[PDB]
Amino acid sequence: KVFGRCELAAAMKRHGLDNYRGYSLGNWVCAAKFESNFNTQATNRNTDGSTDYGILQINSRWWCNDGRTPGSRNLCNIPCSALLSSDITASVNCAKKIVSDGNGMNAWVAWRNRCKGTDVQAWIRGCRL
Ligand code: NA
Ligand code: NA
Numbered sequence: 001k002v003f004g005r006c007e008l009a010a011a012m013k014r015h016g017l018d019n020y021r022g023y024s025l026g027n028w029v030c031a032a033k034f035e036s037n038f039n040t041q042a043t044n045r046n047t048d049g050s051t052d053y054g055i056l057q058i059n060s061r062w063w064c065n066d067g068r069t070p071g072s073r074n075l076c077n078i079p080c081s082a083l084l085s086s087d088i089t090a091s092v093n094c095a096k097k098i099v100s101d102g103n104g105m106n107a108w109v110a111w112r113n114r115c116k117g118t119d120v121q122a123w124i125r126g127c128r129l
């Protein structure tokens with residue numbers, strides 16, 4: 001599924017990401033924009049052979065099992081394909097673990113390079129929330 005900007009904002013807010021570990025909703029929307037263009041089916045290979053999945057490009061190196069990432073973990077206890085669903089629950093619950101793990105949103109390279117330090121509230125302008 002390709003979410004609309006405000007559509008995703010609303011789903012993310014309903015799932016409890018607005019100020020989760022202090023990251024305002026616009027941080028999450030910004031991250032999703034640059035990780036997946038709001039596309040739940042997005043997949044991209046990493047140099048180390050792991051793969052990033054779904055709307056927040058969650059990595060098979062640590063967080064999910066895709067059956068082909070050797071010496072990896074599955075800290076969210078999910079197949080990686082669950083992160084490609086039109087329903088974002090599994091990505092959101094997994095993101096909550098990731099963001100809590102010490103490095104906050106810096107775990108998302110797109111967030112650190114394109115959102116951090118910017119006026120991320122722009123990402124939710126116009127949205128009924
Ligand atoms: Na990425
Ligand atoms: Na943090």
